[PDB]
Design a binder for this molecule. Structure first.
Ligand SMILES: [Cl-]
Ligand SMILES: [Cl-]
Ligand SMILES: [Cl-]
Ligand SMILES: [Mg+2]
Ligand SMILES: [Mg+2]
Ligand SMILES: [Mg+2]
Ligand SMILES: [Mg+2]
Ligand SMILES: [Mg+2]
Ligand SMILES: [Mg+2]
Ligand SMILES: [Mg+2]
Ligand SMILES: [Mg+2]
Ligand SMILES: [Mg+2]
Ligand SMILES: [Mg+2]
Ligand SMILES: [Mg+2]
Ligand SMILES: [Mg+2]
Ligand code: NA
Ligand code: NA
Ligand code: NA
Ligand code: NA
Ligand code: NA
Ligand code: NA
Ligand code: NA
Ligand code: NA
Ligand code: NA
Ligand code: NA
Ligand code: NA
Ligand code: NA
Ligand code: NA
Ligand code: NA
Ligand code: NA
Ligand code: NA
Ligand code: NA
Ligand code: NA
Ligand code: NA
Ligand SMILES: [Sr+2]
Ligand SMILES: [Sr+2]
Ligand SMILES: [Sr+2]
Ligand SMILES: [Sr+2]
Ligand SMILES: [Sr+2]
Ligand SMILES: [Sr+2]
Ligand SMILES: [Sr+2]
Ligand SMILES: [Sr+2]
Ligand SMILES: [Sr+2]
Ligand SMILES: [Sr+2]
Ligand SMILES: [Sr+2]
Ligand SMILES: [Sr+2]
Ligand SMILES: [Sr+2]
Ligand SMILES: [Sr+2]
Lengths: 115, 145, 246, 119
RNA sequence: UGUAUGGCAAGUCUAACCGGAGUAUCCGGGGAGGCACAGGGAAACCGACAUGGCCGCAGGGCUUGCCCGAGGGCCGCCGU
RNA sequence: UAUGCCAGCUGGUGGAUUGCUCGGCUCAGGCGCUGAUGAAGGACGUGCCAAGCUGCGAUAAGCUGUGGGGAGCCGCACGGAGGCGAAGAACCACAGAUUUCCGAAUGAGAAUCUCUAACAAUUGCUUCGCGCAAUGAGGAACCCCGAGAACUGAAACAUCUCAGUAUCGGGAGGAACAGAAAACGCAACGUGAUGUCGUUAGUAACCGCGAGUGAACGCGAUACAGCCCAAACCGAAGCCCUCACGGGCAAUGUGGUGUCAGGGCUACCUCUCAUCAGCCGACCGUCUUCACGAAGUCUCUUGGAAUAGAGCGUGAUACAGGGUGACAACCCCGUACUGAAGACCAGUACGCUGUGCGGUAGUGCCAGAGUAGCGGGGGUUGGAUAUCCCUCGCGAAUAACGCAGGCAUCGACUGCGAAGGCUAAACACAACCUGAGACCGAUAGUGAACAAGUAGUGUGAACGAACGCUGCAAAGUACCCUCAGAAGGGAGGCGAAAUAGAGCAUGAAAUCAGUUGGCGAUCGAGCGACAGGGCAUACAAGGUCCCUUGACGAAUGA
């Protein structure tokens, strides 16, 4: 039972996109978000720099934090970003909300899940 | 609805037989009783081990890895930008009540650094000197002899 | 966005940009938490006398007279919880912490979110307030803080089509239950909040259900009474500006 | 205080001089204009009109003012007993209005006319 | 010591207390100190993988079995 | 059908329930000593009629004055008779008068009385005379100094723990205690009286090294405040009593100087605004009390009664709370605003008077002994070798000296001067005042909403209940009949209501009387569940049900 109304809406929107469009990621990210908070992703920057590649969206099924350096020109999509993360990402790429990524790419194509 | 809330009418409140939840006998004694007898299990063994040195002769060093310095160099624009030069004593937090500042060598050094600190490790040098740089010891650091 | 400023006659007098905090997403769970914390922190510690029912040397006779082993004194049973005039087994204790902690960041975000709920005209109407407006919050000129008469603020709110909310709050409910005997006999709907800058509106305070506040200390309870977001508020132009850096 | 228990308590246990405020009744239109007060302490000489009880509408002279029980006896506002005797029905001054005053006292008249004080 | 929810996140939280005020609520201040941010050793003392290899779930890609494969698994290697 | 079973109806019994709150419980702020000038407490008195409570004291529910208050009053307590008040009573605030006996209890004795001048007893001063003074006892807890358990925990138990707890002895105050370093020892080129709060920390330390026990320095805060002797050198320059006279004290030293920014003496420089003594003496704030204080008691309907519904209108720096015959901002008290007084802060702060801060050189003049310290024996503590204290024995130096810095000795280094003394503020408690409440709501909450520490129990120490509600208004039931009758009953009267009629709102269950329906004197016992028949049923809140026939028709199936 998620108490946050915004997280509840996001999960509903991730499901609607997984069913209507050809997305097999948005409903998979919805399943991890429905799981307990401790099982959610708490990813730092040094991990996105290690496994992500350009022109391929990075989906984090949790929150992105600011430890480490990011050089790659990647578009990171997450539930939330720490103040420092969003700042460090926008310097060398784009920090996009998961709510936007659904409207931009409802089919969930060319996307890497990083946790 | 919680567990406690569903107990009215259960008689035993999850205790099993009504002969269970009585005194300390159900716990096998009070507190850590029988830690060497009936409840010896998962208890740290009995005995004395080692010694402690008096608190005022005990030094506390402030540590920092080369990785933490190197990851935040461009953000540390409030310091010297040489041919980068950074005094470690001004970077580390809690460095007031600490005896000395030591730089440890964990991680990579992707920049040319000139670090000034009280102490360095053998790995802190190899990684900074090997990536084109110098290690400067303070006047307090002149204890190594 | 833009917010239309009004003079003491209810006519448009320019407009200033509605601050960024009014665009914070409404988060009723956080607001409700901040109000629950505020309501509990003013609660007083109570508890029964630690010795109530224990002031007796009552002893149990034990086996022998065909009676239960209950402590008696002068043929009258005493002390034990199952006995009339006996102690209370698990009574309210004074040692109990009746206060709730809240993180400053979590509480500040609730203040901001409640301030934002003020901007949405549909939420304000959903909360219960009676008004005939599209634009909300009602923004009035700094010359409001200089009004002395209450009946003069009535005229201004009638000019602003916002008085119907006081007609809503002009009906006291005589509560059900024993709260009556303790002084909590009446209650009335929460109506308009008046946020000023220098000092709270002496002129508006006595209006039915109206609460007065200041931009430096207006809290989640003023903004969202009972945890319900979207209160029909009226700011002073400088109050609207001061409430921005909160 | 705000507490009901303490409020009713202070009224029932009020000393004799403070019980004067419990026998106060509203003045008529002409009398409010003349003395600058809304109400007055009812005296055993005044003429009064009953505004609320069963005797609502009747006028009469105030025969007795009991500070103890905080009630007044007005002329012809009576109840008939079983023996046929007419005994007075006590009235709360809150259910009554003063139409004419008794100003035989120098002090009561002086108190009523002064703008700094009230009677 | 767990768990569910929520805030912030390489950090996080203030305590006593101070100021304000609508005066027990509440707004502002207060990081003293705590826990986390490196460990091993009784101690002296010393001080680590921002990834090198192989499998491979979910997921993505493609010319539809082939690739990329976070997390995970098995190894290496590093500190003491 | 008798005795009788089950359910109901009318009426009781009972006092649950619901509603109500004059009492509690808890938190918060303020405030805080009394007593030989006889307290606190107790006894006995005191009223026109007076048993209890409250008050009061032979002047006895009260006397006097000033201020407030006001036409009424004569307590709780609504009677009768009578009285008092415009000669300003009642009532309230401050001040004063009176104030029996026992009581620390003090002339002596004594179960509240008695016998023949009384500070009894112990002290200080002393005119050596009880002449002048002090002590005694009380107080809710808090505070300080002593004495000091056991149950219990350790699953037994002895050290340990419970615990320096309970309890006991002595004592002070409005707060106590502590307190201006022979300190600390983040060892420093550092801190700078003391409490307390947060933290340091369940860390160091202790411990059948078991169970358990448990600091400090520092830091952040609160509040801040620093001084006086002894001695050196002076040597009667002095103090106390008295109006004075005069007396007493004092060379075994009153008084001056001085007190680690050591001082004194000698020699000079400069100068004070330190310090100590004393005078004056608040603001603000806080707590309590008081004065003043806006606007409807209009229409219709209902009602016993508008404070209800519908209609019209009003104030608001006041829509807190209470009262008033039902839901009241505008009927009454209050409430906002403004203003007044007292108390506390505080005889403090500020201001003033006086004194005089300080510096150089010289000088082994002065600087607290059973002490510092060592040893035997104990207690206590986290204090471990390294806590604090008691006891027995022993026992030093003299600043050119001494102590400390967590084992001893010696040297170095850093810190600091014991064995004399005083000290505001910040902190504890809750008797007392006021305020508050997601506390309880009469088997609750105090033992106590009531005669409550009452009735009552015990030789005594001590123990100890239960009892709240007529009505808008007593209108608290006249008259008549009956009766042995102020009984009770009947009839009658009041009220919206007497099934509101006196322990009188409501009025449950157990249960009782009468009565209705069903069963019933040939019949068998967990009292029922589910099926199906009889008999019984005003309305309302349920409206379905029966039979021929016909359609559909699972498994099964002639
Ligand atoms: Cl990470
Ligand atoms: Cl150690
Ligand atoms: Cl220090
Ligand atoms: Mg009880
Ligand atoms: Mg109820
Ligand atoms: Mg007047
Ligand atoms: Mg005697
Ligand atoms: Mg035992
Ligand atoms: Mg053992
Ligand atoms: Mg101990
Ligand atoms: Mg220490
Ligand atoms: Mg002197
Ligand atoms: Mg001991
Ligand atoms: Mg009781
Ligand atoms: Mg009754
Ligand atoms: Na049990
Ligand atoms: Na420090
Ligand atoms: Na008792
Ligand atoms: Na029995
Ligand atoms: Na508490
Ligand atoms: Na800190
Ligand atoms: Na029989
Ligand atoms: Na007091
Ligand atoms: Na009497
Ligand atoms: Na007296
Ligand atoms: Na004496
Ligand atoms: Na004498
Ligand atoms: Na045991
Ligand atoms: Na035994
Ligand atoms: Na032990
Ligand atoms: Na009235
Ligand atoms: Na000894
Ligand atoms: Na020392
Ligand atoms: Na009762
Ligand atoms: Sr269980
Ligand atoms: Sr037990
Ligand atoms: Sr063993
Ligand atoms: Sr620090
Ligand atoms: Sr036996
Ligand atoms: Sr009276
Ligand atoms: Sr009376
Ligand atoms: Sr914080
Ligand atoms: Sr100081
Ligand atoms: Sr000395
Ligand atoms: Sr040593
Ligand atoms: Sr006996
Ligand atoms: Sr009758
Ligand atoms: Sr068929």
């Amino acid at each position: 039972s998620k108490t946050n109304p915004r997280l509840s809406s996001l999960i509903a929107d991730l499901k609607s996109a997984a069913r209507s469009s050809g997305g097999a990621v948005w409903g998979d990210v919805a399943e991890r978000l429905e799981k307990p908070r401790r099982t959610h992703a708490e990813v730092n920057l040094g991990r996105i720099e290690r496994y992500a590649q350009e022109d391929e969206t990075v989906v984090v099924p949790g929150k992105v934090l600011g430890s480490g350096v990011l050089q790659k020109d990647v578009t990171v999509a997450a539930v939330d970003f720490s103040g420092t993360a969003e700042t460090k990402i926008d310097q060398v790429g784009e920090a996009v909300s998961l709510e936007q990524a659904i409207e931009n790419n409802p089919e969930g194509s060319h996307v890497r899940v990083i946790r | 609805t919680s567990k406690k809330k569903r107990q009215r009418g259960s008689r035993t409140h999850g205790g099993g037989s009504h002969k269970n939840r009585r005194g300390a006998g159900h716990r096998g004694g009070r507190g850590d009783a029988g830690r060497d007898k009936h409840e010896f299990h998962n208890h740290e063994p009995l005995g004395k081990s080692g010694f402690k040195r008096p608190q005022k002769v005990q030094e506390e060093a402030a540590t920092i890895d080369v990785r933490e310095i190197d990851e935040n160099v461009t953000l540390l624009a409030a310091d010297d930008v040489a041919e980068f030069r950074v005094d470690v004593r001004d970077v580390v937090e809690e460095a007031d009540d600490a005896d000395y500042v030591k730089v440890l060598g964990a991680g990579q050094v992707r920049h040319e650094l000139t670090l000034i600190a009280d102490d360095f490790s053998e790995g802190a040098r190899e990684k900074v000197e090997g990536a084109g740089g110098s290690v400067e010891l303070t006047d307090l650091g002149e204890e190594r002899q | 966005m833009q917010a239309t400023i009004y003079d003491l006659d209810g006519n448009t007098d320019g407009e200033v940009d509605l601050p960024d905090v009014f665009e914070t997403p409404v988060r009723s769970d956080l607001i409700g938490k901040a109000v629950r914390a505020a309501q509990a922190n003013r609660k007083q510690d109570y508890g029964s006398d630690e010795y109530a029912g224990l002031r007796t040397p009552a002893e149990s006779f034990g086996s022998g007279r065909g009676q239960a082993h209950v402590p008696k004194q002068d043929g009258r049973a005493r002390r034990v919880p199952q006995a009339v005039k006996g102690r209370s087994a698990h009574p309210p204790k004074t040692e109990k912490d009746r206060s709730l902690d809240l993180n400053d960041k979590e509480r500040q975000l609730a203040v901001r979110s409640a301030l934002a709920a003020t901007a949405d005209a549909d939420l304000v109407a959903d909360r219960g307030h009676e008004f005939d407006r599209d634009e909300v919050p009602v923004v009035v000129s700094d010359d409001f803080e200089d009004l002395v008469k209450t009946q003069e603020v009535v005229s201004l709110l009638e000019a602003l089509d916002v008085h119907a909310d006081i007609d809503r709050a002009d009906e006291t409910k005589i509560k059900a239950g024993q709260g009556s005997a303790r002084g909590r006999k009446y209650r009335r709907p929460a109506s308009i909040l008046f946020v000023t800058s220098d000092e709270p509106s002496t002129a508006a305070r006595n209006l039915a259900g109206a609460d007065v506040a200041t931009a430096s200390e207006v809290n989640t309870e003023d903004l969202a009474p009972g945890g319900a977001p979207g209160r029909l508020t009226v700011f002073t132009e400088s109050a609207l500006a001061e409430v921005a850096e909160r | 205080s705000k507490q009901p228990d303490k409020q009713r308590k202070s009224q029932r246990r009020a000393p004799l001089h403070e019980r004067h405020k419990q026998v106060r009744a509203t003045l008529s239109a002409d009398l409010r204009e003349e003395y600058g007060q809304r109400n007055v302490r009812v005296n055993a000489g005044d003429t009064v009109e009953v505004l609320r009880g069963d005797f609502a509408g009747e006028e009469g002279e105030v025969i007795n003012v009991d500070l103890d029980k905080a009630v007044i006896h007005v002329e012809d506002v009576t109840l008939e007993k079983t023996d046929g005797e007419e005994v007075p029905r006590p009235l709360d001054t809150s259910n009554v209005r003063v139409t004419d005053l008794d100003l035989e006292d120098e002090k009561r008249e002086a108190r009523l006319e002064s703008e700094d004080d009230s009677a």
